[PDB]
Ligand SMILES: CCCCCCCCCCCCCCCC(=O)O
């Protein structure tokens with residue numbers, strides 16, 4: 282291991298090496314032109330090949346951190362452009378590396394990347410495929426500076442495949458656009474989880490995280506023994522703790538080690554882990570992370586034996602409380618992959634509470650029996666919600682389903698901005714389209730996965746612009762009571778109906794030309810303002826207003842004259858609706 286850079290070059294390969302180096306530099310030097318980074322990439326690459334040919338070369342023995350920090354300090358416009366960051370260069374390793382991480386800017390001031398014309402993209406993709414993909418990879422990296430580089434490279438390859446398919450099909454846009462939308466969503470979904478998980482570790486501590494890890498690991502690796510799960514949880518915590526620090530190399534090494542250990546102890550962990558452990562170093566940790574759940578052993582008892590009817594229960598618990606609780610969580614999780622992680626945590630928390638209570642009583646054996654009865658109400662709560670919402674999603678369309686959620690959440694928290702209500706409603710609706718197509722056995726985990734980011738995304742916007750105390754309470758409570766807290770929200774009887782605005786309910790003929798998406802957007806916007814104006818409106822009354830509006834749109838988008846119809850029949854529609862409500 283004379284040369285870190287040479288070893289990395291051999292493992293990753295030239296292509297991947299180039300991309301990762303581009304991303305790394307782009308995440309630090311977020312305000313340097315693309316051509317600047319291309320020069321850096323080529324300089325580092327050629328030096329790497331130097332080390333590949335001879336690990337005893339002049340600078341090949343240097344550390345990856347040292348080489349990287351050295352290149353950064355060679356940038357001429359470094360002090361002019363980044364100011365304080367240039368002061369890091371005066372420091373010594375390893376102090377210098379820590380300094381560069383501190384002055385890493387998160388979400389700087391850059392214009393939003395506008396998706397160009399399909400014809401323009403495919404033409405550029407054809408003429409200069411490399412400079413086209415790399416230039417965009419540079420644009421994404423500089424904007425999402427804390428996104429794990431290898432993951433960011435994972436999406437880039439998928440983007441390349443999307444253009445390869447569609448850019449030589451007759452109807453390109455019909456192929457490409459739906460794919461680019463899928464990536465954009467997954468890209469921000471993956472980016473949301475990453476910050477959420479890192480925020481959890483800092484906010485609730487390692488214990489709550491370990492409890493979360495024990496649950497999901499036991500679900501994925503039900504055949505694994507508790508001792509094996511403990512080790513995995515322990516190292517998983519060490520990985521995310523380091524990964525959230527920000528150091529790419531250190532983070533990469535920890536993930537690689539874990540993937541290294543898991544593949545070597547494959548028989549001791551999971552059976553459905555063969556393909557992932559066959560893939561290259563760059564795809565190992567990624568493949569394992571989202572591996573399919575292994576199928577649990579056929580002969581599995583109930584927990585009542587070791588956690589209820591058994592003696593020495595308090596003895597074993599008091600001997601090592603978190604361990605014992607972890608064992609309960611392990612045993613319960615491996616049996617219920619159909620459960621959300623948080624649900625298992627609620628159950629474990631419940632089991633914890635009773636042991637603290639009953640183990641102090643005269644005869645603890647009694648208060649044990651109470652426990653498992655307490656689980657049912659907690660379990661069926663998320664189950665009933667899923668059944669009802671999916672049935673609602675089945676009867677009404679997704680769009681109509683979004684509208685239903687729209688009126689519901691508007692009546693619960695009318696203070697929320699209209700654009701925000703419209704966004705979360707459409708998102709929750711999309712969650713319904715995705716998860717409700719799963720059978721019950723896999724619905725709850727699916728819902729947890731999507732709602733977690735939607736709810737945290739929601740609390741983030743509320744963080745910057747607070748509007749409701751009730752919403753703030755849910756956003757600041759335990760991540761196990763977050764979703765339930767939101768579901769506990771009732772209609773706001775405090776809300777004073779906002780004053781009428783004619784412009785808000787004035788429609789023009791332009792909506793007839795609007796895309797099917799933004800026509801819904803403007804209609805859903807008007808719906809939110811309608812509920813905000815008269816919140817005490819019933820479902821029948823509202824449906825009556827919505828029907829008249831729907832017919833009003835068809836009668837003006839079907840006539841010879843259009844703008845006059847929207848202005849005149851628009852006056853009629855508004856006057857008639859005001860009277861009914
Ligand atoms: C001279 C310094 C150049 C810096 C080059 C950065 C190299 C990054 C190496 C990333 C390897 C990550 C391997 C995959 C690990 C994982 O499972 O996530």
Ligand SMILES: CCCCCCCCCCCCCCCC(=O)O
Pocket residue numbers: 488489491492495511514603604606607610626629630633759761
């Ligand atoms: C390998 C052992 C991991 C540690 C297991 C700890 C089990 C804790 C059980 C209580 C659920 C934790 C939920 C968040 C914190 C809390 O509410 O107590």
Ligand SMILES: CCCCCCCCCCCCCCCC(=O)O
Pocket residue numbers: 666690694697701705732739742743746748752764767768769
């Ligand atoms: C910036 C503040 C945003 C406020 C958002 C108001 C809308 C709240 C929506 C809550 C969704 C709850 C999802 C869980 C399912 C349920 O129990 O209904």
